[PDB]
Amino acid sequence: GPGMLSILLSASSSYQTQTIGRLTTPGTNLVKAYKSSNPDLARNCYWLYFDYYVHILGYENGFAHVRIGTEDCWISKDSLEEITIPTQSVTEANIYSEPSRTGTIVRYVPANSQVTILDFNCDGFYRINYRGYIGYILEDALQYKWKQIDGANDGERAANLVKTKLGCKYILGMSGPDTYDCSGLMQWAYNRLDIFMHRTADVQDLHGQLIEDAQDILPGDIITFRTDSDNPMLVTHVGMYVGNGQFIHASTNGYVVKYQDFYKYPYPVSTIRRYWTK
């Protein structure tokens, strides 16, 4: 106020200067992703998709180095655009040199100042430009919120996000904004929380915290299923638990994103996976 800093913040930061990207995938909906800026172009690690949000770590050799949560990869620089976000501060604060409790002061920012967000989710800070001064401001000092404040945890936030897509049409291979398949809905929802999961159900099945007893399931957990009786050991479907014994999924039954009663769903569960941590 403006000098108070919480002991819950680290006194050190390794957070590198980043910007915000939004995937535009010109002429299509996807872009190949790689694990280097000089890849074996035949061996892309996966793809990223139209209207996903990323952090941009830099550019090299025609690629953008992008990050979603703990995951980083390289995509063609023409597949995304840089984004800056105007907002205003609501309380006086300092812009600091880094997102820690020991940064130097770049500039004092009075309450009600117009600022521009350059990066988000920076360990409790945004990176901003105020009047040409650049650095990190505590995230609650700004009006703009990159994710819901409501909810006890990011699992509840993920459950809200899939609810916002109820009624969207099922289309194989899609991940929004208007159409989805089952696993694309999951990856999209977590993209909006800056958390990476892989794109297909059979890989989503292999990561996240394993919730071994269904009694322990919570909103935002994903449930994978084996639904193909000609390949009965393969994971082929996924949905997101949203509480009250229901999950939401994109289903070919109805060709729509809809609720489903978990206990009555007539296909075996493979795993329950928790990709949220706070």
TrEMBL record:
One of its GO terms (molecular function) is cysteine-type peptidase activity. It comes from the Eukaryota. It holds the Pfam family SH3_3. Residues 152-278 form the NlpC/P60 domain. InterPro entries: NLP_P60_dom, Papain-like_cys_pep_sf, PG_Endopeptidase_C40, SH3-like_bac-type. Coiled coil: none annotated. GO terms for biological process: proteolysis. Keywords: Hydrolase, Protease, Thiol protease. Belongs to the peptidase C40 family. This is Clan CA, family C40, NlpC/P60 superfamily cysteine peptidase. The lineage of its organism: Eukaryota, Metamonada, Parabasalia, Trichomonadida, Trichomonadidae.
